[PDB]
Design an enzyme around this catalytic site. Structure first.
Site, PDB file in Angstrom:
ATOM      1  N   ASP A   1       0.808  -1.224   0.000  1.00  0.00           N
ATOM      2  CA  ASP A   1       0.000   0.000   0.000  1.00  0.00           C
ATOM      3  C   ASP A   1       0.850   1.288   0.000  1.00  0.00           C
ATOM      4  O   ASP A   1       1.975   1.302   0.501  1.00  0.00           O
ATOM      5  CB  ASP A   1      -0.985  -0.029   1.186  1.00  0.00           C
ATOM      6  CG  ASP A   1      -2.097   1.009   1.182  1.00  0.00           C
ATOM      7  OD1 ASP A   1      -2.410   1.551   0.089  1.00  0.00           O
ATOM      8  OD2 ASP A   1      -2.665   1.272   2.270  1.00  0.00           O
TER       9      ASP A   1
ATOM     10  N   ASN B   1     -10.759  -3.946  -5.725  1.00  0.00           N
ATOM     11  CA  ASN B   1     -10.158  -3.229  -6.857  1.00  0.00           C
ATOM     12  C   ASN B   1     -10.955  -3.331  -8.177  1.00  0.00           C
ATOM     13  O   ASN B   1     -10.739  -2.505  -9.070  1.00  0.00           O
ATOM     14  CB  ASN B   1      -8.696  -3.653  -7.056  1.00  0.00           C
ATOM     15  CG  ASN B   1      -7.760  -3.208  -5.949  1.00  0.00           C
ATOM     16  OD1 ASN B   1      -6.726  -3.825  -5.703  1.00  0.00           O
ATOM     17  ND2 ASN B   1      -8.091  -2.129  -5.245  1.00  0.00           N
TER      18      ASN B   1
END
Ligand code: M2H
Ligand code: CA
Lengths: 226, 213
Positions: free
Chosen positions: B15, B45
């Site tokens: 991340d 996503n």
């Protein structure tokens, strides 16, 4: 915005007993009392659900005297909580494998859940003989039993169907998970339920945990505090 | 603390994005880490705009092609976990080529989680168990943790004992829920594109107890 469902791993009881030069399992005795101000803070603040990790699947492999002490402390806790649940309009629940628990303790758990099931200000859940892995496999077993009864087509099993069989499926997802005691680990707690939980770790040992720090953790989640 | 044991299986949530992996993979081989699992693309996503999904599919294709010669040179096994039904046909064929050409490699196992979610993984395992029940291979009464775990992805590898989350957030994001049930958790403010092998080594040493947080 307040978290809808807070979960707590109450670690640091045995370390507190050694630090303050106390007797064997005195940390667990001091620890049991820390929950009352936090439960009251939750109901007064508007937290809809609080789930606490009282006894894990793994805790069955701890020294037998610790297991005996934890069962006696759970029995004592349930008796003490029943009048409090009625006073504060809190529904009391238990999650975990009941097959491994003493029969008289299961009877007391059934009574407490039955007598408080109609309460609606908050849901307090105590995880007893609980593990996230046990929970998930138990949900898989219930789905497979439904397949065997011809109620469900196995080819149609997905996240949305499976979620209905995991513990606390009627409560919101865990949005805040607190762990006291200084360790950075989920330790097989609410694996499915806390899939998107914000995490709050602290070095504060459970028998030393305060409403001020609990409220700070709530304000860290909201954005009120840094 | 006389013996300092490194983690056997490290997982990383990459991340902070909104080449870093290559020296981390090489450091696992150097230090004896048997497996590395990385979170590339989540179930979540897919809910992003179509042009972003298309760009991510191109980046995944590019990354797999670039990694195949490295997996062969270093004798590393390359695997993928996640729902492949949602992916383009040529990308799935590429994933199959990479995993088939490297399946016997023994230096380490590198797993890339693509179109992956911990909940998806668990429900997928529940589905396969239920299918075995419907075919009469097993009775539903035999389903317990010991039987179920066999169906969860990466059950042949050691349990995840160290999970690194870069990007500064202290949260669970539907990554290896079952596999990392007991993993030590390492959180850092360092953004993934700036993550170093020096910091990766520090996380390994925090796990072993050689270094402190
Ligand atoms: C078990 C577990 C811990 C964390 C931080 C995650 C994720 N994502 N899963
Ligand atoms: Ca049967």
């Amino acid at each position: 915005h307040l978290p809808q469902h807070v979960a707590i791993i109450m670690d640091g009881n045995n370390r507190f007993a050694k630090k303050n030069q106390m007797q064997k399992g005195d940390g667990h005795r001091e620890g049991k009392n820390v929950l009352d101000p936090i439960v009251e803070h939750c109901v007064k603040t508007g937290v809809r659900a609080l789930t606490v990790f009282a006894f894990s699947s793994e805790n069955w492999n701890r020294p037998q005297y610790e297991v005996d002490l934890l069962m006696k402390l759970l029995e004592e806790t349930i008796h003490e909580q029943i009048p409090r649940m009625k006073k504060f309009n809190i529904a009391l629940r238990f999650i975990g494998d009941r097959s491994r628990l003493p029969s008289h303790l299961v009877a007391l758990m059934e009574d407490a859940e039955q007598q408080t099931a109609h309460h609606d200000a908050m849901t307090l859940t105590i995880a007893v003989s609980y593990g996230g892995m046990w929970d998930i496999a138990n949900a898989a077993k219930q789905v497979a039993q439904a397949v065997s009864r011809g109620e469900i087509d196995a080819d149609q099993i997905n996240v949305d169907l499976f979620e209905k069989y995991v513990s606390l499926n009627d409560l919101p997802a865990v949005d805040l998970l607190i762990r006291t005691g200084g360790d950075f680990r989920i330790s097989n707690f609410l694996l499915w339920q806390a899939a998107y939980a914000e995490l709050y770790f602290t070095d504060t040992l459970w028998p030393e945990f305060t409403v001020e720090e609990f409220d700070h953790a709530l304000n860290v989640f909201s954005g009120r505090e840094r």
